[PDB]
Design a protein around this ligand. Structure first.
Ligand SMILES: Nc1ncnc2c1ncn2[C@@H]1O[C@@H]2COP(=O)(O)O[C@H]3[C@@H](O)[C@H](n4cnc5c(N)ncnc54)O[C@@H]3COP(=O)(O)O[C@H]2[C@H]1O
Ligand SMILES: Nc1ncnc2c1ncn2[C@@H]1O[C@@H]2COP(=O)(O)O[C@H]3[C@@H](O)[C@H](n4cnc5c(N)ncnc54)O[C@@H]3COP(=O)(O)O[C@H]2[C@H]1O
Ligand SMILES: [Mg+2]
Ligand SMILES: [Mg+2]
Ligand SMILES: [Mg+2]
Ligand SMILES: [Mg+2]
Ligand SMILES: [Mg+2]
Length: 90
RNA sequence: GCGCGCUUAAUCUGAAAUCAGAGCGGGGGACCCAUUGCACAGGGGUGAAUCCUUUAGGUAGGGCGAAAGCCCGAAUCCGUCAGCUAACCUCGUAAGCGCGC
């Protein structure tokens, strides 16, 4: 179900948070203004990221356009976040 | 208090003691392997002490014992955090009882 925030998984877990967040911003900022990027390397949350766009249209185009993209030698897997981000609800 | 036996990683050596060694342990922590995970109590550690039913029984598991059998099946701590893991870093060495003089 379409959301302001997109959920990406199947990401290379060896890549550190700063570099990962930097690369994600680099790649997704062209689709529109990005509100934020949440990345965690914990055991449960590693290999995943949440990209929160200012506009939902950006999220949709980004998902449709970047689906399966070779990123750090692994094809990105992109779906929509199950729940709205704190930033949008507020 | 002391003698030797018990659980335990809980012992031994410095006149006594975490203040220090040795011994014996716990945790953190790469390559490789494993993990596909919906974020903003949870997760995890030591330990045999985990689990289902109406305060209780049973139970995975565990202790003593030559085997019969008798028991235990607690407590607690890190604080949103930890897989395996070599190097390297860090900590613990409390306590409760059974026999006899
Ligand atoms: N690690 C463990 N895992 C699971 N259960 C455990 C356990 N450690 C102990 N238990 C159980 O709980 C009781 C605790 O006894 P405790 O050691 O306080 O007191 C014990 C012990 O201090 C002493 N004792 C037992 N066996 C001994 C022996 N062979 N020699 C000298 N003393 C002994 O007499 C008491 C008799 O205890 P008993 O064996 O009937 O009962 C024990 C035991 O059955
Ligand atoms: N991987 C992990 N994930 C999440 N939390 C973790 C963890 N590892 C340890 N912890 C937590 O932090 C404390 C670790 O203390 P420490 O580093 O001194 O590591 C140990 C050790 O110094 C000592 N210890 C415990 N069991 C031991 C054993 N069997 N042998 C030797 N030392 C032991 O006491 C501490 C453990 O008990 P404490 O009550 O201090 O509680 C633990 C526990 O609550
Ligand atoms: Mg262990
Ligand atoms: Mg049994
Ligand atoms: Mg024994
Ligand atoms: Mg570890
Ligand atoms: Mg790790």
């Amino acid at each position: 179900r379409p959301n302001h925030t997109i959920y990406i998984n199947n990401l290379n877990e060896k890549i550190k948070k700063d570099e990962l967040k930097k690369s994600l911003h680099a790649i997704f900022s062209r689709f529109g203004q990005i509100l934020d990027i949440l990345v965690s390397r914990s055991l449960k949350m590693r290999g995943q990221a949440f990209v929160i766009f200012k506009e939902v249209s950006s999220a949709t185009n980004a998902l449709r356009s970047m689906q399966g993209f070779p990123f750090y030698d692994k094809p990105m897997r992109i779906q929509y976040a199950k729940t709205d981000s704190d930033i949008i609800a507020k």
